[PDB]
């Protein structure tokens, strides 16, 4: 039981270690379920064969796939980190992905054959593994083509829209509903109290917290475009609460992490880059709201702090624009370009420096050592290939002064120069950027149906204000949304569903590899063969 | 397609105006000059018209304002973001998704020649700048098509005749496809080996 919570994650608990259990233990029976001891020995010893015999036998055979994925994914890395043959990791991946291509073609049966009994399949509590959800399950394993099936996506746009039965047309009426609170009595429900479930669906708190972001970012526009005074105005103090506020926010996030250490949670949430950025934009804003109420430099310099700052919360526009479905993955795929952009920047730069430091060293021969130096090199060759080129200034004429010598080359290396940049290298990265399209939109589209699920769990986990209001409910301080309570009958009616999914499942793919080409090619070989001997041992026979 | 991109190169370029303008001139009074200055230079800027002296002005001179110099750090990352990532990844969405819409669009203009075609047989023989007349004085063919009894039993011959070709060229084109003749030669094969056990099975000497 310890080596199975330790090798399925943080908050795993298995029934070994339980009291009940423990109870029993200690003063020496049956198990109920024996095939799940049966089939989890199995995953631990390493015997394929006699697990996948396990498998199909007995119930909750989805619950049983995902969890020998994750035990197979967390034994494979072990065995990794061991500096062990590395045959054995590799052998362990091939259980891994075994087990879980058993899952995704068992969720395929079942929501083609139901799809109502499909998703109650995908949320009931499984008390025999440690009170999860499939669902859960199947992220803890970070199995994408299992979330990105339609089924889990179905399941959560509905787990997305909470207790409202609107479908064709959201978002606008959403908004018209915040904006216009007796508007809400207007909206559908599934099955005054209209109120509270308006205010608690995740997509209403999804749109109120962006409804307050933009209000945010238009006072940072205002107060960085006008004049400001000696102390912070009513639309600073605005900025500077949502600002503290979202600090805050994020400060006390992080002590509701699933680990228990104070240190191991800064790192766990250290791993999102949006995180790291926002903790740095934080820190630079601190830095220069507390530089703005001194004397005029120190204030001008602050002031300059928030302009430079204000660029980050523009660009953070992108991240809530990834909430869409056509415009994530695209974001996505700008993030995986920006390395192969990359790549070519630092040739584009070598040719360009080149070019810079042998027109300054031609040009102007009788220079004293100045910083000025270094920036001539770069300005001018880099303004000329975004169409700023100007004859008159890369080779002045020479009542002109006196020509400097070898002044002629200049026009022929900026020739070459523009021909190489402008013709040769971009033309390359378009090739480039063409030819791995495909594979870079695939990747990205799973991605972010993969991601749809922790922003549910994120706007289900938030308080119904947003930032600049949650000042107070920071103070103050799952029947849906995350699981599914069920009855026994129920229980037993999806018990009985799975079984016959599973049974379906193995008859189909036993018809169809018995009426394969190859199959049948080789059985009439056979028989044919068989069916030759025995007609030379008849004929060989002279009975006249 | 086009769209779905103009928005993000909107919110780049907006925070690249309002950095410069708001760094560039620190004393002003709110005027609806403002909302000008963030859009216009910006946009034009992509398009060609790039001026280094105007971007960043330099600094007998003027006093240099506080971080003139971030200006130009900016704008030669705003030109890399726009000039070449988003414009070389819109090239490539236009590649990639060419021979559907070609194809879709084809199709759609095949099926668009029936109502341009119907519009222009039922419309007055003067065009528009003198129909007024027509509007006062307010199918053998290009429609349908009237025919006799003999013509018409001619059209129903026909029509059988072909659909009686048509099932049998399926039949025929069914029946000798490697899958069904692998089928059929298994099915026999083993029927003939039951029956050949069968008959060594008896033992008459
Ligand atoms: C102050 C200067 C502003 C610098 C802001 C750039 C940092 C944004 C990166 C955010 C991130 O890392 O998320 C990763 C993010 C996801 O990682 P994950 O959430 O941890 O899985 O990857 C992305 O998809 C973001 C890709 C779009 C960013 C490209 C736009 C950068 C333009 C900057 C230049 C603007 C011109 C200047 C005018
Ligand atoms: C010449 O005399 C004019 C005077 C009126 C002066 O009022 C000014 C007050 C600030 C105000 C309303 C004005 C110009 C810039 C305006 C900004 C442009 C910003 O752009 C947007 C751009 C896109 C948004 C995402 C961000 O903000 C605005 C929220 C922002 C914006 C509309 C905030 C409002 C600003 C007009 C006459 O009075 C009678
Ligand atoms: C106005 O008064 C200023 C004066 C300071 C004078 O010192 C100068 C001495 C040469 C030095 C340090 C300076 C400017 C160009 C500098 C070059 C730029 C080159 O770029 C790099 C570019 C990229 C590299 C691959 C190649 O070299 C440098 C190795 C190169 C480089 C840094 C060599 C160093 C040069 C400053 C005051 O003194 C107290
Ligand atoms: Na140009
Ligand atoms: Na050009």
Same mark, same amino acid.
């Given at each position: 039981?310890?080596? &199975?919570?330790?090798?399925?994650?943080?908050?795993?608990?298995?029934?070994?270690? #339980?009291?009940?259990?423990?109870?029993?233990?200690?003063?020496?029976?049956?198990?109920?379920?024996?095939?799940?001891?049966?089939?989890?020995?199995?995953?631990?010893?390493?015997?394929?064969?006699?697990?996948?015999?396990?498998?199909?036998?007995?119930?909750?055979?989805?619950?049983?796939?995902?969890?020998?994925?994750?035990?197979?994914?967390?034994?494979?890395?072990?065995?990794?980190?061991?500096?062990?043959?590395?045959?054995?990791?590799?052998?362990?991946?091939?259980?891994?992905?075994?087990?879980?291509?058993?899952?995704?073609?068992?969720?395929?049966?079942?929501?083609?054959?139901?799809?109502?009994?499909?998703?109650?399949?995908?949320?009931?509590?499984?008390?025999?593994?440690?009170?999860?959800?499939?669902?859960?399950?199947?992220?803890?394993?970070?199995?994408?083509?299992? &979330?990105?099936?339609?089924? %889990?996506?179905?399941?959560?746009?509905?787990?997305?829209?909470?207790?409202?039965?609107?479908?064709?047309?959201?978002?606008?009426?959403?908004?018209?509903?915040?904006?216009?609170?007796?508007?809400?009595?207007?909206?559908?429900?599934?099955?005054?109290?209209?109120?509270?479930?308006?205010?608690?669906?995740?997509?209403?708190?999804?749109?109120?917290?962006?409804?307050?972001?933009?209000?945010?970012?238009?006072?940072?526009?205002?107060?960085?475009?006008?004049?400001?005074?000696?102390?912070?105005?009513?639309?600073?103090?605005?900025?500077?609460?949502?600002?503290?506020?979202?600090? &805050?926010?994020?400060?006390?996030?992080?002590?509701?992490?699933?680990?228990?250490?104070?240190?191991?949670?800064?790192?766990?949430?250290?791993?999102?880059?949006?995180?790291?950025?926002?903790?740095?934009?934080?820190?630079?804003?601190?830095?220069?709201?507390?530089?703005?109420?001194?004397?005029?430099?120190?204030?001008?310099?602050? #002031?300059?702090?928030?302009?430079?700052?204000? *660029?980050?919360?523009?660009?953070?526009?992108?991240?809530?624009?990834?909430?869409?479905?056509?415009?994530?993955?695209?974001?996505?795929? +700008?993030?995986?370009?920006? *390395?192969?952009?990359?790549?070519?920047? +630092?040739?584009?730069?070598?040719?360009?420096?080149?070019?810079?430091?042998?027109?300054?060293?031609?040009?102007?021969?009788?220079?004293?050592?100045?910083?000025?130096?270094?920036?001539?090199?770069?300005?001018?060759?880099?303004?000329? +290939?975004?169409?700023?080129?100007?004859?008159?200034?890369?080779?002045?004429?020479?009542?002109?002064?006196?020509?400097?010598?070898?002044?002629?080359?200049?026009?022929?290396?900026?020739?070459?120069?523009?021909?190489?940049?402008?013709?040769?290298?971009?033309?390359?990265?378009?090739?480039?950027?063409?030819?791995?399209?495909?594979?870079?939109? %695939?990747?990205?589209?799973?991605?972010?149906?993969?991601?749809?699920?922790?922003?549910?769990?994120?706007?289900?986990?938030?308080?119904?204000?947003?930032?600049?209001?949650?000042?107070? %409910?920071?103070?103050?301080? #799952?029947?849906?949304?995350?699981?599914?309570?069920?009855?026994?009958?129920?229980?037993?009616?999806?018990?009985?569903?799975?079984?016959?999914?599973?049974?379906?499942?193995?008859?189909?793919?036993?018809?169809?590899?018995?009426?394969?080409?190859?199959?049948? +090619?080789?059985?009439?070989?056979?028989?044919?063969?068989?069916?030759?001997?025995?007609?030379?041992?008849?004929?060989?026979?002279?009975? %006249?």
């Amino acid at each position: 039981g310890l080596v &199975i919570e330790y090798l399925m994650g943080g908050a795993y608990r298995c029934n070994y270690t #339980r009291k009940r259990f423990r109870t029993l233990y200690h003063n020496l029976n049956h198990f109920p379920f024996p095939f799940h001891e049966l089939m989890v020995w199995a995953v631990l010893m390493k015997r394929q064969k006699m697990a996948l015999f396990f498998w199909q036998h007995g119930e909750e055979a989805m619950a049983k796939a995902l969890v020998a994925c994750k035990l197979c994914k967390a034994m494979a890395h072990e065995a990794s980190e061991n500096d062990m043959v590395d045959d054995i990791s590799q052998e362990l991946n091939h259980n891994s992905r075994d087990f879980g291509q058993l899952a995704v073609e068992l969720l395929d049966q079942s929501y083609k054959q139901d799809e109502q009994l499909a998703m109650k399949l995908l949320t009931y509590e499984l008390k025999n593994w440690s009170n999860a959800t499939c669902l859960q399950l199947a992220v803890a394993a970070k199995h994408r083509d299992f &979330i990105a099936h339609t089924c %889990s996506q179905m399941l959560l746009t509905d787990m997305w829209m909470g207790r409202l039965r609107m479908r064709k047309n959201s978002g606008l009426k959403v908004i018209l509903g915040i904006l216009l609170p007796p508007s809400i009595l207007s909206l559908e429900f599934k099955n005054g109290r209209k109120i509270y479930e308006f205010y608690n669906a995740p997509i209403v708190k999804f749109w109120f917290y962006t409804l307050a972001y933009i209000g945010y970012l238009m006072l940072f526009n205002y107060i960085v475009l006008v004049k400001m005074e000696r102390w912070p105005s009513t639309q600073e103090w605005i900025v500077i609460s949502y600002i503290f506020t979202l600090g &805050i926010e994020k400060m006390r996030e992080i002590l509701m992490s699933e680990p228990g250490k104070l240190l191991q949670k800064v790192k766990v949430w250290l791993q999102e880059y949006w995180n790291v950025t926002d903790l740095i934009a934080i820190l630079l804003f601190s830095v220069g709201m507390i530089l703005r109420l001194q004397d005029q430099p120190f204030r001008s310099d602050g #002031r300059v702090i928030y302009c430079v700052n204000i *660029i980050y919360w523009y660009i953070r526009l992108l991240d809530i624009f990834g909430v869409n479905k056509y415009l994530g993955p695209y974001v996505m795929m +700008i993030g995986k370009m920006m *390395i192969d952009m990359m790549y070519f920047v +630092i040739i584009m730069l070598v040719v360009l420096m080149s070019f810079g430091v042998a027109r300054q060293a031609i040009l102007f021969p009788n220079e004293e050592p100045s910083w000025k130096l270094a920036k001539n090199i770069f300005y001018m060759p880099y303004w000329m +290939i975004y169409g700023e080129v100007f004859a008159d200034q890369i080779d002045p004429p020479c009542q002109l002064p006196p020509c400097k010598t070898g002044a002629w080359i200049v026009p022929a290396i900026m020739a070459c120069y523009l021909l190489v940049a402008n013709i040769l290298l971009v033309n390359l990265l378009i090739a480039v950027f063409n030819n791995t399209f495909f594979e870079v939109k %695939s990747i990205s589209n799973q991605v972010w149906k993969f991601q749809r699920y922790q922003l549910i769990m994120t706007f289900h986990e938030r308080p119904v204000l947003p930032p600049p209001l949650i000042i107070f %409910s920071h103070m103050t301080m #799952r029947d849906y949304g995350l699981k599914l309570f069920i009855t026994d009958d129920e229980l037993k009616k999806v018990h009985d569903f799975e079984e016959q999914c599973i049974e379906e499942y193995f008859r189909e793919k036993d018809d169809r590899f018995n009426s394969s080409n190859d199959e049948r +090619i080789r059985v009439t070989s056979e028989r044919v063969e068989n069916m030759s001997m025995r007609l030379e041992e008849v004929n060989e026979r002279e009975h %006249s």
